[PDB]
A paper describes a structure:
One interesting member of the trypsin family of serine proteases is urokinase-type plasminogen activator (uPA), which catalyses the conversion of the zymogen plasminogen into the active protease plasmin through cleavage of plasminogen's Arg15–Val16 bond (using the chymotrypsin numbering). From a phage-displayed peptide library, we previously isolated a serum-stable, disulfide bond-constrained peptide, CPAYSRYLDC, termed mupain-1, which competitively inhibits murine uPA (muPA). While being unable to generate crystals of muPA, we did manage to crystallise huPA-H99Y, a murinised version of human uPA which, in contrast to human uPA wt, is able to bind mupain-1, although with a somewhat lower affinity than muPA. In the complexes, the inhibitory peptides adopt cyclic conformations with an overall Ω shape.
We determined the structures huPA-H99Y in complex with mupain-1 (CPAYSRYLDC) itself as well as with either of two other inhibitory peptides, namely mupain-1-12 (CPAYS[4-guanidinophenylalanine]YLDC) and mupain-1-16 (CPAYS[L-3-(N-amidino-4-piperidyl)alanine]YLDC). Two variants of mupain-1, with the unnatural amino acids L-4-guanidino-phenylalanine or L-3-(N-amidino-4-piperidyl)alanine as P1 residues instead of the original Arg, have a 2- to 10-fold improved affinities. Mupain-1-12 and mupain-1-16 have around 10-fold higher affinities to huPA-H99Y than mupain-1. The analysis showed very similar conformations of the three peptides when bound to huPA-H99Y. In each of the structures, the amino acid in position 6 of the peptide, i.e., Arg, 4-guanidinophenylalanine, or L-3-(N-amidino-4-piperidyl)alanine, forms polar interactions to Asp189, Ser190, and Gly218 in the S1 pocket. Considering the unexpected effect of the D9A substitution, we also crystallised mupain-1-16 D9A in complex with huPA-H99Y, but in spite of the much higher affinity of the D9A peptides, the structures of the mupain-1-16 and the mupain-1-16-D9A complex were indistinguishable. Noticeably, however, the relative B-factor for mupain-1-16 D9A was higher than that for mupain-1-16 (1.39 versus 1.24). Importantly, the presence of the peptides in both a trans- and a cis-conformation in solution should be contrasted with the fact that only the trans-conformation was observed in the crystal structures of the peptide-enzyme complexes. In both cases, the bound forms of the peptides had the Cys1-Pro2 peptide bond in the trans conformation, showing that the binding involves a shift in the equilibrium between the conformations towards the trans-form.
Residue numbers in the entry:
A (entry chain P): 1 to 10
B (entry chain U): 16 to 37, 37A, 37B, 37C, 37D, 38 to 60, 60A, 60B, ...
Write the structure that this text describes.
Amino acid sequence: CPAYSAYLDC
Amino acid sequence: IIGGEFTTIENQPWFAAIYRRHRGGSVTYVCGGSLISPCWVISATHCFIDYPKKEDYIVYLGRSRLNSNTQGEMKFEVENLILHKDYSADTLAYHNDIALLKIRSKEGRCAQPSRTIQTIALPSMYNDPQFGTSCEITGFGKEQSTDYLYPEQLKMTVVKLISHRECQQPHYYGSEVTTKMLCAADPQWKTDSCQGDSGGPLVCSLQGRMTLTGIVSWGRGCALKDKPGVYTRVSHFLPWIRSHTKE
Ligand SMILES: N=C(N)N1CCCCC1
């Protein structure tokens, strides 16, 4: 996961 | 969506809700997407990369609520999951963050348009609105960064496009923003996309048409000063889209 992910599983 | 307002699927009838099935049977929300033709939904690759098996996904159209059915809704299996070959993820952000889902019902049918289920127009190549233009975002993402839960009711808000020049300054994201991305934010930074809005539509009316200008991709925090939302710039991906949609 990149620090600026918005993905509901990060 | 931070701030904005609750809405219903009639106000964004191309909105696709994407869910992932589990083994012991539980189904959970994954990402947003946008219906661009009866058999095709566009979303973001990062939604799927970790579990890229199509059999694992369900798509709903005409759905206004996250974990309750909406009258008139349609459920679909994912016949084909197409992830962009040049996708990458940094310490910070995603690149080429775009995906296509070919949907078919257990009956073998694509989406049947209705008052709650419509397609959205793609843009013209390399043609995006002016910076400062107001556009709409929609999704079931968090209402606050600190929330553990996601809203059960769909939401939407407005953000304004930011110049590439402005978004590339280190005060903002510096070099992390490429030309295949678009930034957009609230001038007070009070409203934004957030966790679980990924893959969903950024919609602008360029000329007279409501048009899919961006796909929710990344950002630092949500509704955070000097940290805009970043969107896959759909007008830079038209050859990729038409190529993989001619079947
Ligand atoms: N727009 C913002 N702030 N985002 C986009 C979605 C991932 C979370 C951060």
